[PDB]
Design a binder for these strands. Structure first.
Ligand SMILES: [Zn+2]
Length: 118
RNA sequence: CGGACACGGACAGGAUUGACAGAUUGAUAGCUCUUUCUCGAUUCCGUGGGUGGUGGUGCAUGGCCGUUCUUAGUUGGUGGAG
């Protein structure tokens, strides 16, 4: 009840991510890839094939979420506002985490990993 | 572009930077073009609004300066005259 809800919220304050329409499928090619995330609403079955094309033979893990729009307020483009429109982003399908920096509640995302995926 | 901001759009399933090579230039200006790699919300676009100007107007002015003006000249108060 803690992995899907809140311990991926706290890995998002000022950490490394992908941003915009030119680097979502970019970060996979580097040897700094910690926990990444992919949306299970992707219109083509080739992009989701392409993110598992690297990580399934390597040390990198994706978590399948609903869509990328609900990840749009997770990347950093905050559009939910008091005098602002709560609908401005069409969010990202693949962001990574380069470095955590803080270790308050960062265990519970990797606790999900080696519990079934070993 | 060194067009700030403000709003809408464009906008992670494809906004924007940079650049080797060649006909391409006056020019090793990616200026543009053919082709392709690269940059990470930075911008780009429309609409308002700034802003810059050795642009106008010295007869819209300030300041400074020249001059009549290198000569002795000028002004109140209170009384006097009208
Ligand atoms: Zn003029």
């Amino acid at each position: 009840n803690t992995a899907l809800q809140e311990v991926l919220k706290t890995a998002l304050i000022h950490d490394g991510l992908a941003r915009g329409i030119r680097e979502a499928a970019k970060a996979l090619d580097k040897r700094q890839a910690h926990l990444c995330v992919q949306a299970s609403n992707c219109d083509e079955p080739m992009y989701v094939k392409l993110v598992e094309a690297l990580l399934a033979e390597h040390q990198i893990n994706l978590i399948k979420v609903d869509d990328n729009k609900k990840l749009g307020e997770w990347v950093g483009l905050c559009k939910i506002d008091r005098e602002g429109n709560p609908r401005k982003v069409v969010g990202c399908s693949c962001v990574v985490v380069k470095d955590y920096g803080k270790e308050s509640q960062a265990k519970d995302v990797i606790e999900e990993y080696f519990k079934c995926k070993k």
